[PDB]
PDB file of all heavy atoms in Angstrom:
ATOM      1  N   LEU N   1       2.033  -8.719   6.092  1.00 44.87           N
ATOM      2  CA  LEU N   1       2.218  -9.283   4.760  1.00 44.87           C
ATOM      3  C   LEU N   1       0.913  -9.638   4.066  1.00 44.87           C
ATOM      4  O   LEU N   1       0.878  -9.713   2.834  1.00 44.87           O
ATOM      5  CB  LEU N   1       3.107 -10.533   4.835  1.00 44.87           C
ATOM      6  N   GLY N   2      -0.166  -9.858   4.818  1.00 47.05           N
ATOM      7  CA  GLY N   2      -1.426 -10.293   4.267  1.00 47.05           C
ATOM      8  C   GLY N   2      -2.303  -9.148   3.782  1.00 47.05           C
ATOM      9  O   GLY N   2      -1.971  -7.969   3.883  1.00 47.05           O
ATOM     10  N   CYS N   3      -3.458  -9.535   3.242  1.00 44.27           N
ATOM     11  CA  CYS N   3      -4.440  -8.599   2.707  1.00 44.27           C
ATOM     12  C   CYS N   3      -5.736  -8.758   3.486  1.00 44.27           C
ATOM     13  O   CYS N   3      -6.270  -9.867   3.589  1.00 44.27           O
ATOM     14  CB  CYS N   3      -4.675  -8.837   1.212  1.00 44.27           C
ATOM     15  N   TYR N   4      -6.239  -7.654   4.031  1.00 45.27           N
ATOM     16  CA  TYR N   4      -7.420  -7.669   4.879  1.00 45.27           C
ATOM     17  C   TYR N   4      -8.672  -7.380   4.048  1.00 45.27           C
ATOM     18  O   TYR N   4      -8.681  -7.514   2.822  1.00 45.27           O
ATOM     19  CB  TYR N   4      -7.254  -6.671   6.023  1.00 45.27           C
ATOM     20  N   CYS N   5      -9.748  -6.985   4.722  1.00 45.05           N
ATOM     21  CA  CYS N   5     -11.013  -6.668   4.072  1.00 45.05           C
ATOM     22  C   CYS N   5     -10.925  -5.273   3.449  1.00 45.05           C
ATOM     23  O   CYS N   5      -9.841  -4.725   3.240  1.00 45.05           O
ATOM     24  CB  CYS N   5     -12.162  -6.784   5.068  1.00 45.05           C
ATOM     25  N   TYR N   6     -12.084  -4.704   3.106  1.00 52.24           N
ATOM     26  CA  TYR N   6     -12.181  -3.388   2.478  1.00 52.24           C
ATOM     27  C   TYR N   6     -11.296  -2.344   3.155  1.00 52.24           C
ATOM     28  O   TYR N   6     -10.733  -1.474   2.482  1.00 52.24           O
ATOM     29  CB  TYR N   6     -13.634  -2.912   2.473  1.00 52.24           C
ATOM     30  N   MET N   7     -11.167  -2.420   4.481  1.00 51.17           N
ATOM     31  CA  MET N   7     -10.252  -1.527   5.188  1.00 51.17           C
ATOM     32  C   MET N   7      -8.817  -1.735   4.720  1.00 51.17           C
ATOM     33  O   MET N   7      -8.102  -0.774   4.413  1.00 51.17           O
ATOM     34  CB  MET N   7     -10.369  -1.745   6.697  1.00 51.17           C
ATOM     35  N   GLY N   8      -8.376  -2.994   4.659  1.00 52.91           N
ATOM     36  CA  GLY N   8      -7.063  -3.295   4.119  1.00 52.91           C
ATOM     37  C   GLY N   8      -6.906  -2.927   2.659  1.00 52.91           C
ATOM     38  O   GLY N   8      -5.807  -2.552   2.241  1.00 52.91           O
ATOM     39  N   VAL N   9      -7.983  -3.007   1.879  1.00 54.70           N
ATOM     40  CA  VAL N   9      -7.920  -2.612   0.475  1.00 54.70           C
ATOM     41  C   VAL N   9      -7.702  -1.109   0.358  1.00 54.70           C
ATOM     42  O   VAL N   9      -6.913  -0.640  -0.471  1.00 54.70           O
ATOM     43  CB  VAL N   9      -9.194  -3.057  -0.266  1.00 54.70           C
ATOM     44  N   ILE N  10      -8.391  -0.330   1.194  1.00 53.51           N
ATOM     45  CA  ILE N  10      -8.185   1.115   1.196  1.00 53.51           C
ATOM     46  C   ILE N  10      -6.784   1.457   1.688  1.00 53.51           C
ATOM     47  O   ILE N  10      -6.145   2.388   1.176  1.00 53.51           O
ATOM     48  CB  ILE N  10      -9.266   1.809   2.044  1.00 53.51           C
ATOM     49  N   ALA N  11      -6.282   0.718   2.681  1.00 56.07           N
ATOM     50  CA  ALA N  11      -4.915   0.935   3.143  1.00 56.07           C
ATOM     51  C   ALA N  11      -3.909   0.641   2.037  1.00 56.07           C
ATOM     52  O   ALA N  11      -2.940   1.387   1.853  1.00 56.07           O
ATOM     53  CB  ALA N  11      -4.632   0.074   4.372  1.00 56.07           C
ATOM     54  N   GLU N  12      -4.127  -0.440   1.283  1.00 55.54           N
ATOM     55  CA  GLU N  12      -3.246  -0.764   0.167  1.00 55.54           C
ATOM     56  C   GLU N  12      -3.350   0.266  -0.949  1.00 55.54           C
ATOM     57  O   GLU N  12      -2.357   0.542  -1.628  1.00 55.54           O
ATOM     58  CB  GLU N  12      -3.567  -2.160  -0.366  1.00 55.54           C
ATOM     59  N   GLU N  13      -4.535   0.847  -1.152  1.00 54.78           N
ATOM     60  CA  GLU N  13      -4.671   1.910  -2.144  1.00 54.78           C
ATOM     61  C   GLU N  13      -3.891   3.150  -1.728  1.00 54.78           C
ATOM     62  O   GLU N  13      -3.199   3.765  -2.549  1.00 54.78           O
ATOM     63  CB  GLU N  13      -6.147   2.247  -2.353  1.00 54.78           C
ATOM     64  N   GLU N  14      -3.985   3.530  -0.452  1.00 57.36           N
ATOM     65  CA  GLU N  14      -3.188   4.651   0.041  1.00 57.36           C
ATOM     66  C   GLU N  14      -1.696   4.351  -0.059  1.00 57.36           C
ATOM     67  O   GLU N  14      -0.892   5.241  -0.370  1.00 57.36           O
ATOM     68  CB  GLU N  14      -3.576   4.978   1.484  1.00 57.36           C
ATOM     69  N   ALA N  15      -1.309   3.097   0.194  1.00 57.90           N
ATOM     70  CA  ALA N  15       0.090   2.710   0.062  1.00 57.90           C
ATOM     71  C   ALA N  15       0.558   2.817  -1.383  1.00 57.90           C
ATOM     72  O   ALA N  15       1.651   3.321  -1.648  1.00 57.90           O
ATOM     73  CB  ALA N  15       0.294   1.291   0.592  1.00 57.90           C
ATOM     74  N   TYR N  16      -0.253   2.348  -2.332  1.00 57.11           N
ATOM     75  CA  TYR N  16       0.093   2.489  -3.740  1.00 57.11           C
ATOM     76  C   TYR N  16       0.133   3.946  -4.176  1.00 57.11           C
ATOM     77  O   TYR N  16       0.890   4.290  -5.090  1.00 57.11           O
ATOM     78  CB  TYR N  16      -0.897   1.712  -4.608  1.00 57.11           C
ATOM     79  N   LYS N  17      -0.665   4.808  -3.541  1.00 59.77           N
ATOM     80  CA  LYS N  17      -0.615   6.231  -3.861  1.00 59.77           C
ATOM     81  C   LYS N  17       0.673   6.868  -3.350  1.00 59.77           C
ATOM     82  O   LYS N  17       1.304   7.660  -4.060  1.00 59.77           O
ATOM     83  CB  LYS N  17      -1.834   6.943  -3.278  1.00 59.77           C
ATOM     84  N   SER N  18       1.080   6.537  -2.122  1.00 56.56           N
ATOM     85  CA  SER N  18       2.291   7.090  -1.523  1.00 56.56           C
ATOM     86  C   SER N  18       3.516   6.210  -1.765  1.00 56.56           C
ATOM     87  O   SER N  18       4.543   6.374  -1.097  1.00 56.56           O
ATOM     88  CB  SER N  18       2.084   7.312  -0.025  1.00 56.56           C
ATOM     89  N   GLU N  19       3.422   5.276  -2.711  1.00 55.77           N
ATOM     90  CA  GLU N  19       4.446   4.268  -2.954  1.00 55.77           C
ATOM     91  C   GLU N  19       5.704   4.790  -3.635  1.00 55.77           C
ATOM     92  O   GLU N  19       6.488   3.961  -4.103  1.00 55.77           O
ATOM     93  CB  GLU N  19       3.855   3.130  -3.789  1.00 55.77           C
ATOM     94  N   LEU N  20       5.934   6.099  -3.719  1.00 59.98           N
ATOM     95  CA  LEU N  20       7.216   6.578  -4.233  1.00 59.98           C
ATOM     96  C   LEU N  20       8.373   6.035  -3.397  1.00 59.98           C
ATOM     97  O   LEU N  20       9.274   5.359  -3.913  1.00 59.98           O
ATOM     98  CB  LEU N  20       7.232   8.107  -4.258  1.00 59.98           C
ATOM     99  N   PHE N  21       8.350   6.310  -2.090  1.00 63.92           N
ATOM    100  CA  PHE N  21       9.384   5.785  -1.205  1.00 63.92           C
ATOM    101  C   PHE N  21       9.328   4.267  -1.113  1.00 63.92           C
ATOM    102  O   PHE N  21      10.360   3.623  -0.897  1.00 63.92           O
ATOM    103  CB  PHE N  21       9.249   6.407   0.186  1.00 63.92           C
ATOM    104  N   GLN N  22       8.144   3.676  -1.287  1.00 61.63           N
ATOM    105  CA  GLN N  22       8.034   2.221  -1.260  1.00 61.63           C
ATOM    106  C   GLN N  22       8.791   1.594  -2.425  1.00 61.63           C
ATOM    107  O   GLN N  22       9.537   0.626  -2.248  1.00 61.63           O
ATOM    108  CB  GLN N  22       6.563   1.804  -1.284  1.00 61.63           C
ATOM    109  N   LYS N  23       8.619   2.144  -3.629  1.00 61.48           N
ATOM    110  CA  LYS N  23       9.358   1.659  -4.788  1.00 61.48           C
ATOM    111  C   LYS N  23      10.845   1.962  -4.667  1.00 61.48           C
ATOM    112  O   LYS N  23      11.675   1.160  -5.112  1.00 61.48           O
ATOM    113  CB  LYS N  23       8.792   2.275  -6.068  1.00 61.48           C
ATOM    114  N   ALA N  24      11.201   3.101  -4.069  1.00 63.12           N
ATOM    115  CA  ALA N  24      12.612   3.388  -3.821  1.00 63.12           C
ATOM    116  C   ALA N  24      13.234   2.328  -2.917  1.00 63.12           C
ATOM    117  O   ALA N  24      14.309   1.788  -3.213  1.00 63.12           O
ATOM    118  CB  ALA N  24      12.766   4.780  -3.210  1.00 63.12           C
ATOM    119  N   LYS N  25      12.561   2.010  -1.809  1.00 58.98           N
ATOM    120  CA  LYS N  25      13.059   0.985  -0.898  1.00 58.98           C
ATOM    121  C   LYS N  25      13.059  -0.392  -1.548  1.00 58.98           C
ATOM    122  O   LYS N  25      13.937  -1.210  -1.260  1.00 58.98           O
ATOM    123  CB  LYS N  25      12.224   0.969   0.382  1.00 58.98           C
ATOM    124  N   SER N  26      12.093  -0.666  -2.428  1.00 59.96           N
ATOM    125  CA  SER N  26      12.074  -1.947  -3.127  1.00 59.96           C
ATOM    126  C   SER N  26      13.258  -2.073  -4.075  1.00 59.96           C
ATOM    127  O   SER N  26      13.883  -3.137  -4.158  1.00 59.96           O
ATOM    128  CB  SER N  26      10.757  -2.111  -3.885  1.00 59.96           C
TER     129      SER N  26
END
């Protein structure tokens, strides 16, 4: 649930890029 350092920021960017299914599940 939390936000990490630059590594976590890049992971969140990849998640926002692939977030089609994420928004569907939301």
